[PDB]
Amino acid sequence: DAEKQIIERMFLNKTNQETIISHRLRRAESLAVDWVSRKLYWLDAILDCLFVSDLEGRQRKMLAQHCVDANNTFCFENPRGIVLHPQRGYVYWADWGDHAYIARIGMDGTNKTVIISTKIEWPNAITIDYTNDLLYWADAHLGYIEFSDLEGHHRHTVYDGTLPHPFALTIFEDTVFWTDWNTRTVEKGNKYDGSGRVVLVNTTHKPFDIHVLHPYRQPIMSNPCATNNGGCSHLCLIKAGGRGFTCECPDDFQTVQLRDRTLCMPMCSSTQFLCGNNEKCIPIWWKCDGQKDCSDGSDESDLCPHRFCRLGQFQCRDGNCTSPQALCNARQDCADGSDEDRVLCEHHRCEANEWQCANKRCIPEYWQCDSVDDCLDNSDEDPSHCASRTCRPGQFKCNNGRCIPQSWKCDVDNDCGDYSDEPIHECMTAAYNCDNHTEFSCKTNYRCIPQWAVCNGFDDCRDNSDEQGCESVPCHPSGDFRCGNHHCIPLRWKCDGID
Amino acid sequence: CRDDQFTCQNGQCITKLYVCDEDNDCGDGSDEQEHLCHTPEPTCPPHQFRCDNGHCIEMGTVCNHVDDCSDNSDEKGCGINECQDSSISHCDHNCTDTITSFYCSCLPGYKLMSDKRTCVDIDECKETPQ
Ligand SMILES: *[C@@H]1O[C@H](CO)[C@@H](O)[C@H](O)[C@H]1NC(C)=O
Ligand SMILES: *[C@@H]1O[C@H](CO)[C@@H](O)[C@H](O)[C@H]1NC(C)=O
Ligand SMILES: *[C@@H]1O[C@H](CO)[C@@H](O)[C@H](O)[C@H]1NC(C)=O
Ligand SMILES: *[C@@H]1O[C@H](CO)[C@@H](O)[C@H](O)[C@H]1NC(C)=O
Ligand SMILES: *[C@@H]1O[C@H](CO)[C@@H](O)[C@H](O)[C@H]1NC(C)=O
Ligand SMILES: *[C@@H]1O[C@H](CO)[C@@H](O)[C@H](O)[C@H]1NC(C)=O
Ligand SMILES: *[C@@H]1O[C@H](CO)[C@@H](O)[C@H](O)[C@H]1NC(C)=O
Ligand SMILES: *[C@@H]1O[C@H](CO)[C@H](O)[C@H](O)[C@H]1NC(C)=O
Ligand SMILES: *[C@@H]1O[C@H](CO)[C@H](O)[C@H](O)[C@H]1NC(C)=O
Ligand SMILES: [Ca+2]
Ligand SMILES: [Ca+2]
Ligand SMILES: [Ca+2]
Ligand SMILES: [Ca+2]
Ligand SMILES: [Ca+2]
Ligand SMILES: [Ca+2]
Ligand SMILES: [Ca+2]
Ligand SMILES: [Ca+2]
Ligand SMILES: [Ca+2]
Ligand SMILES: [Ca+2]
Ligand SMILES: [Ca+2]
Ligand SMILES: [Ca+2]
Ligand SMILES: [Ca+2]
Ligand SMILES: [Ca+2]
Ligand SMILES: [Ca+2]
């Protein structure tokens, strides 16, 4: 649930309903469930990462970050869809960022690989057929459903540019079912040639992610982690290739190897709290809130002060309440000043999409040398720091110590202020030619815009060539609606109360 | 750009004659794109026959026993049934003579190879899962 930002589980008889993950879900796009090793996998598009947990939410680990091809050509930016294959020990996902891709990783985090990298712009849907080891995906911009073999070496089209904005896809027998946003419908067709096509139902809201429920869609295989979690202390995950298992530690633990053994050492920070079983480490405000958070009950002990504040608020010695974001932000928000106590802020750690300042404050990484004093100690824009800075995978650095997406290099806007992001003598080379399937070129300059940007009502390239000839641009035969401005919009947006 | 000019993806206008001159007049290489310069040039009508010198002959004139074409392949072996011969057309599976010279074919389900004499077997379960 994205409005509540939670994960919920229920029984198929509607008898019991439970919330499993309720914390640190910024923008969770898709969920996968593993029946062999009894695991839950999901994607987050604000932390730009992939997570694994147990079906009861008792432990969590992050298996992928940054870039999938070691060359930095593709990287987690908008990861939408996920599918699992246990017999091969692989996890497959898709991303619809500037550089769209489909990638596979091993269920223990190993063998990070890119499978599809061409003729792909908006891959919302990804699924696998276990009867013959085939991988299917759908693209909403190019309007297709394609299937390949699990390595990506052969490609075939079920539909070849006729589907307006699909979102999710599933397969059973000789049939494939998919959900469509722009016509708000669920459709079935034949998985090899798209023959025998019908609309099963249409809805008032957006249909979202579809599944087929039958035993054969979760095939039987032996669990390698079955006997006592394979001896693993915290997490047991299937190895890449599907044979054998790997022991691992939650995300605030350090993993180390010993003779025929593995060890997890808790390394969790101030403003966090550790449980006696070394199971998990939890935020400090959880420590005494009336809710048992450690499985052993180690946090919610009787030897605790009175809990004045609401559940999830942070409490000061005075018995006053502040939002946890207040804690260690270099300004006093609580009378006691416990909000900025040295004991709590020393050895403090920020979120994965943040950078830390000498005063133990966290700011988004894009603020880091934006020429603004975002940190009151001015530690972010220290000239020595902005000069020695090395930026994270998949973005590009400028002389003034500022970093921008790799895509922003070689176009028309001086994104770094200084024109170092656009070295003309490099940008005018054949290396920056527009993708002939998914991009449009503007006659006055060396800038590419996505094909959906053309005739959208905006001057996306500064010569306005992308909005000139729109009387000639047809709308998609079904799924689009046309405006007297010679614009095309999704038919879901007709009669929605917004201009 | 001018009417006389050609426009490049890098945003340069060049005199149109430059196109496909094989000079990289535009650093983007738009000026020398393969699909821009390629043409269906090797063609002659169904009424005609085509010869190695770049010349085409009416089918009645072919095999008149007289040079129509510099290479003489209109006459060189015209009317000979090469697939009745054995040393030539040393071919794997099936040989079909044509009015001059020969051509070769593989058995159904097999594939024919670039030497135009060898036969191969398709891996159907990768070539066409359908
Ligand atoms: C509705 O779902 C239930 C399981 O929750 C299933 O048993 C039932 O067959 C479904 N309805 C129909 C018409 O199949
Ligand atoms: C990485 O990208 C560069 C520039 O496009 C290319 O030359 C190189 O072959 C790529 N791959 C590797 C493995 O370096
Ligand atoms: C839904 O499908 C039915 C049957 O084809 C059709 O009669 C109806 O008009 C459709 N409704 C919408 C809103 O598309
Ligand atoms: C790892 O991936 C490569 C392809 O990227 C594949 O050739 C290799 O067999 C894989 N190995 C394992 C152990 O999964
Ligand atoms: C909370 O802060 C106020 C600041 O004016 C202070 O007066 C008060 O003592 C604090 N609360 C308690 C219960 O002491
Ligand atoms: C894009 O260019 C490639 C050659 O690089 C070609 O095979 C393909 O057909 C082109 N696609 C379109 C949509 O023009
Ligand atoms: C060659 O062609 C004939 C045509 O009748 C066919 O019977 C034969 O099987 C083919 N292959 C061989 C090896 O002769
Ligand atoms: C296209 O045809 C012309 C003549 O009509 C030239 O022969 C040109 O060389 C051809 N292009 C290519 C790439 O062979
Ligand atoms: C070339 O010749 C064939 C017949 O031999 C067809 O007429 C074909 O249409 C010709 N090619 C072109 C480009 O017209
Ligand atoms: Ca993102
Ligand atoms: Ca793109
Ligand atoms: Ca608690
Ligand atoms: Ca504070
Ligand atoms: Ca700022
Ligand atoms: Ca700053
Ligand atoms: Ca920009
Ligand atoms: Ca730029
Ligand atoms: Ca536009
Ligand atoms: Ca809207
Ligand atoms: Ca509207
Ligand atoms: Ca040229
Ligand atoms: Ca020239
Ligand atoms: Ca002759
Ligand atoms: Ca002959």
Curated annotation (Swiss-Prot), chain B:
Instruction: Please list the residue ranges annotated as the EGF-like domain.
Output: 79-120
Q: List the disulfide bonds.
A: C1-C13, C8-C26, C20-C37, C44-C56, C51-C69, C63-C78, C83-C95, C91-C104, C106-C119
Residue positions with a glycan: N94
- LDL-receptor class A domain spans which residues? 1-38, 43-79
Question: Where is it expressed, tissue-wise?
Answer: In the inner ear, strongly expressed in the marginal cells of the stria vascularis (at protein level). In the female reproductive tract, expressed on the luminal side of the uterine epithelium (at protein level). In the adult brain, expressed in ependymal cells of the lateral ventricles where expression is restricted to the ependyma that faces the stem cell niche (at protein level). Expressed in neurons throughout the brain including in the hippocampus, limbic cortices and cerebellum (at protein level).
Q: Which locations, inside or outside the cell, does it occupy?
A: Apical cell membrane; Endosome lumen; Membrane, Coated pit; Cell projection, Dendrite
Tell what triggers its expression.
Down-regulated in the kidney by cannabinoids, such as endocannabinoid anandamide and synthetic cannabinoid HU-210.
Effect of knocking it out?
Severe facial dysgenesis and impaired forebrain development around mid-gestation, absence of Shh expression and decreased cell proliferation in the ventral neural tube, and aberrant expression of morphogens Fgf8 and Bmp4. Reduced expression of homeobox protein Six3 at 8.0 dpc in the prospective forebrain and impaired Shh expression at the ventral midline with resulting midline formation defects and holoprosencephaly. At 9.5 dpc, loss of Shh in the ventral anterior diencephalon and increased Bmp4 expression in the dorsal forebrain.
On subunit structure and binding partners, the annotation says: Binds plasminogen, extracellular matrix components, plasminogen activator-plasminogen activator inhibitor type I complex, apolipoprotein E-enriched beta-VLDL, lipoprotein lipase, lactoferrin, CLU/clusterin and calcium. Forms a multimeric complex together with LRPAP1. Interacts (via PxLPxI/L motif) with ANKRA2 (via ankyrin repeats). Interacts with LRP2BP. Interacts (via NPXY motif) with DAB2; the interaction is not affected by tyrosine phosphorylation of the NPXY motif. Interacts with MB. Interacts with BMP4.
Entry text on domains = Two overlapping PxLPxI/L motifs mediate interaction with ankyrin repeats of ANKRA2. The cytoplasmic domain is required for sorting to the apical cell membrane.
> What is the recorded name of this protein?
Low-density lipoprotein receptor-related protein 2
Q: Which organism is it from?
A: Mus musculus
Q: Which gene encodes it?
A: Lrp2
